[PDB]
Write a protein that binds this ligand. Structure first.
Ligand SMILES: Nc1nc2c(ncn2[C@@H]2O[C@H](COP(=O)(O)OP(=O)(O)O)[C@@H](O)[C@H]2O)c(=O)[nH]1
Ligand SMILES: Nc1nc2c(ncn2[C@@H]2O[C@H](COP(=O)(O)OP(=O)(O)O)[C@@H](O)[C@H]2O)c(=O)[nH]1
Lengths: 178, 416, 417, 177
């Protein structure tokens, strides 16, 4: 009863691995030495007592759908991630990820996590979505999804600027305690 | 360099530090005051008697008080304030050496009740240490290299490197945004940027029309020769001036690349004074650095993983979730490259001809220990899982066996 | 404050002038000129013109950037002083750059006689350079790493590493004894010890009963990219802040061993300011190091030997004695292990399996260049010997072929010359 | 314009450690080993810098055939010996000074005492006493240096590095007559 198991899901290239490495190593994404292993652990303080926050990293691609739920037993909280500059990752939250974790762990709280929020104010990014006839996902539309899908709450962050990053894991710890 | 000019400054910092919660820095301010008073009384003949050396057991930084250009009762009052803040800062191990000279004072006065008090307070200082030492309960701080660049903007801070000692568990997110707001106001929020690159900044690369703050997480550094001391959480933060961080670089010129092109640089920053100090930031005065080639990187992280696995398997109360985290992240990597990318890049017969034999032989030996340590971790997990992780365990074993088979092909050796 | 900084630089320039440290006296005057120029600019008195402030002098030395933290005639007087001491210190190459802002002044004044004189001065400095360049006649100094350990003895020097610029050809023992007796007279003659080992000192291994002064010979360091821009003796001492020294170690943790175990650490120190500066000693603020394996040491030494033999054959007039020194010491080795020790250790079939293919093939190529370089050196030497050396030259040839006989067996390849 | 200086003496006296000491400007603890023979050092004789080429010789008896082939064009010789090894000195007289004087009768030479740091060493002084031997004084060695018409006699130690600079300064002055 010393360790919180938090499991991270979402489509590839939304920045979830990069999110976990920067919070776990206290480094900017460009400055961490790549690792060949999966998963991350960081000490976190509860009332002055030391706890381990275990971060389980999953692959979002279809080839991994059969073995991924084997990591769900004993989870204390789920982070369901999408990038706010990728409406496909946003739609797959409603249409893939929330159902999959609901089905295997219906009583386990989950947070909706928006990533890469710095790219919402990027010209090349906002224009590259213009040529594709798509627009970036605003925070207000993402909080509405969070309430619809019974999420504990919505949190945004950017691994690059670190804005909102700490609050994501503060929110995750508090949900993991029930 | 004027006695009361320095003394009011130290007392001012003490009060600032107390409000800001920098309680070690407050304790240091008072011990520097007591050291100054002792040196002044010694120079102005008064007859502890050695002057500032009296408190070297507390910190060697007080040598600077003997750069000088007040009675016994007030020297002792400074020492009481010092003990108060050692208590509040959890540096309990120093309380004995501050009270010893007070005790000598009161021995002479035959004040037995006071002596009983002083020995009593050294007593719970050591009781507290017995209760909390090496229990990860004391948060002495996190350390950040901070460098300021922009000669049109920064005053004294221009072009110089600091180690900032931050409270408790302050993460990179918090000290970045804090320093950004601070210097966004005195210079303008449109002209201040955070440098994330942990390489030594070259000013010519920077737009002189901007002001830059480089922020990098660092950790106290010790080599195996110093691990003779530095056995406790306190000692790992007691009188330290070296700090390490790593930076990734490829053979090409990028930060990130493949397993066969990934190097890293190891930089060690030295500070002008020792932490804890009368200030919570100390300037860096020099740098030493070394580099590791791709097979050295691989050797390094494989050793660590073997030690992580073995440590968990020899705990008194094995932490099941923490064991699975590392075990699954060793034997069934699915997001990163997996440790087998090391075996393929450096241990296969064709590839191994491109690297020094000793280094190929060291990485082979580590992988054997890796096999055993994954095996021992699979056995420990089996004695701990319940019915809901039986399929989970069976796939871990299946992933482990598939890994030993490939490892056996690559090394041409039977790995059990 | 500008006033105190200027008084200090003026004092240092006289002290340096009195001790004969003329490069440092010249640098003090260029810094004074930088400080006055920035002062007048920030007041509003008005490439390479005084109007720019301190940036005008950046081509002379980047050190003057730090001056950025009374007439125009006075500025010119500072630069005259600099030229004078540039002349005396034999840094003639610098004189053209110091005169440019002076020229800009007299251009605006249409003092065409004076412009005549200044361009004449630049002509005579390059005439001087043409007569002395890379003759080894200019001795700009020797550099030493010096670091102080003694928590109970040293004041501001404690725990700090400096590069000391010493005059002419000051050898290691001279500066060592001088540093010894200097701090033996401020401390106790029995409380000072010279640290001989060149590895980075860890304080734990030291006894606080004594004061320690670590002294190591270093030389100016340039990477292969830089070597193009470091052609002359002046260029190799001009605006430098990187120094290198090598330390021997073995695979097993000892210093010395056999050629198949003998490694070499290469340390690069960087100083806070560039030499020449306003002081003879500059703090080390940075160091990096790297380790050469035994085959890399072999590669290193063999390429050096090939290169120096090549340039001894392609000199204008060949130092016959220096040529025989290097050649005899390559093809007739009788005291040390001889370069075939490198071939036997790394190039023989069974031994080559222990080292990277690319390094083995590179060591093989360098040895072919070594066979050609000795061949070339033997032919040059017999064009220059008298009858007193015909039998000596004959025995050099016999040794050169006995070496090529063994190198052919070891490389399993015919090595002709 | 490089001065040629050939150095002779029976081994273990310190010839080679002496030469690599002063050439590479290192403490003996710190010199990188070299596979090549001979050394070249740049020297200052009152303002004028000179190049001293130093030709090493193997002192063993096997090389008595070919070692004199290095003798032509010599400008000065150095005959060495260890101040704690008597026969190092006893055979300077018996073999070395006859050989170099035979082949080049008019080239000057100097008598060099090496390893002077071990004459003021306690352990070394007793190892000599048991063999009925004691370290050779400067005076007895200066006696001999006058006997066989050497230019002078000098003393050096590569551990001290004291007296070594003097050895080569005197060698160059000798090669300039
Ligand atoms: N601009 C920006 N890029 C990011 C951020 N987080 C991740 N990335 C980039 O997005 C790419 C894919 O991210 P990755 O770590 O693989 O996420 P994952 O595929 O979900 O595990 C990488 O190139 C990252 O550098 C962010 O906050 N901002
Ligand atoms: N104590 C001491 N030992 C020395 C000195 N010079 C040389 N040696 C030692 O004498 C041994 C042999 O000397 P060497 O250099 O081979 O002289 P060589 O055989 O005549 O060429 C080596 O182990 C050296 O360490 C010295 O000045 N002092």
């Amino acid at each position: 009863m010393q360790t919180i198991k938090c499991v991270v899901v979402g489509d590839g290239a939304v920045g979830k691995t990069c999110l976990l490495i920067s919070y776990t190593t206290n480094k900017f994404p460009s400055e961490y030495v790549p690792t060949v292993f999966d998963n991350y652990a960081v000490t976190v303080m509860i009332g002055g007592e030391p706890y381990t926050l275990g971060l389980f990293d999953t692959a979002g691609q279809e080839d991994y759908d059969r073995l991924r739920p084997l990591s769900y037993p004993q989870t204390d909280v789920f982070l369901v991630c999408f990038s706010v500059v990728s409406p496909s990752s946003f739609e797959n939250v409603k249409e893939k990820w929330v159902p999959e974790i609901t089905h295997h762990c219906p009583k386990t709280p989950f947070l909706l996590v928006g990533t890469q929020i710095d790219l919402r104010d990027d010209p090349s990014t906002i224009e590259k979505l213009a040529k594709n006839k798509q627009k970036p996902i605003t925070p207000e539309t993402a909080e509405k999804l969070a309430r619809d899908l019974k999420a504990v709450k919505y949190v945004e962050c950017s691994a690059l600027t670190q804005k909102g990053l700490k609050n994501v894991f503060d929110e995750a710890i508090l949900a993991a305690l029930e | 360099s004027t006695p009361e000019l320095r003394r009011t400054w130290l007392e001012s910092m003490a009060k600032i530090h107390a409000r800001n919660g920098d309680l070690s820095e407050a304790a240091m301010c008072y011990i520097h005051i007591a050291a100054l008073i002792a040196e002044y009384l010694k120079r102005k003949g008064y007859w502890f008697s050695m002057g500032w050396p009296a408190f070297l057991s507390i910190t060697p930084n007080i040598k600077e008080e003997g750069a000088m250009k007040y009675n016994e009762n007030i020297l002792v009052e400074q020492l009481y304030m010092c003990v108060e803040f050692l208590w509040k800062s959890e540096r309990y191990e120093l309380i004995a050496d501050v009270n010893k000279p007070i005790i000598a004072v009161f021995e002479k006065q035959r004040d037995f009740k006071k002596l009983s008090d002083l020995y009593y307070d050294i007593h719970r200082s050591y009781l507290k240490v017995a209760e909390v030492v090496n229990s990860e309960k004391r948060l002495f701080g996190r350390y950040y290299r901070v460098a300021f660049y922009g000669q049109g903007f920064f005053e004294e801070e221009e072009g110089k490197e600091y180690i900032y000692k931050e409270p408790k568990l302050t993460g990179l997110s918090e000290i970045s945004q804090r320093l950004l707001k601070l210097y966004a106001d005195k210079f303008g929020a449109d002209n201040v940027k955070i440098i994330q690159d942990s390489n030594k900044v070259n000013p010519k690369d920077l737009d002189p029309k901007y002001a830059y703050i480089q922020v990098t997480y660092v950790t106290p550094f010790f080599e195996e020769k110093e691990i003779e001391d530095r056995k406790t959480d306190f000692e790992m933060h007691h009188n330290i001036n070296r700090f390490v961080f790593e930076t990734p670089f490829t053979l090409s010129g990028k930060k990130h690349g493949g397993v066969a092109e990934q190097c890293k640089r190891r930089t060690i920053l030295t500070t002008s004074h020792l932490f804890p100090y009368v200030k919570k930031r100390i300037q860096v005065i020099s740098q030493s650095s070394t580099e590791l080639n791709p097979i050295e990187v691989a050797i390094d992280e494989m050793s660590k993983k073997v030690s992580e696995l073995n440590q968990l398997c020899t705990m008194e109360e094995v932490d099941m979730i923490r064991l699975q985290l590392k075990l699954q992240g060793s034997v069934s990597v699915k997001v990163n490259a997996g440790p087998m990318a090391y075996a393929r890049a450096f241990l296969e017969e064709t590839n191994a001809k491109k690297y020094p034999d000793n280094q190929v032989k060291l990485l082979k030996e580590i992988f054997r220990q890796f096999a055993d340590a994954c095996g021992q971790a699979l056995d420990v997990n089996e004695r701990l899982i319940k019915e809901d992780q039986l399929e989970y365990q069976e796939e871990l074993r299946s992933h482990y066996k598939d890994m030993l088979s490939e490892l056996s092909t690559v090394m041409n050796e039977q790995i059990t």
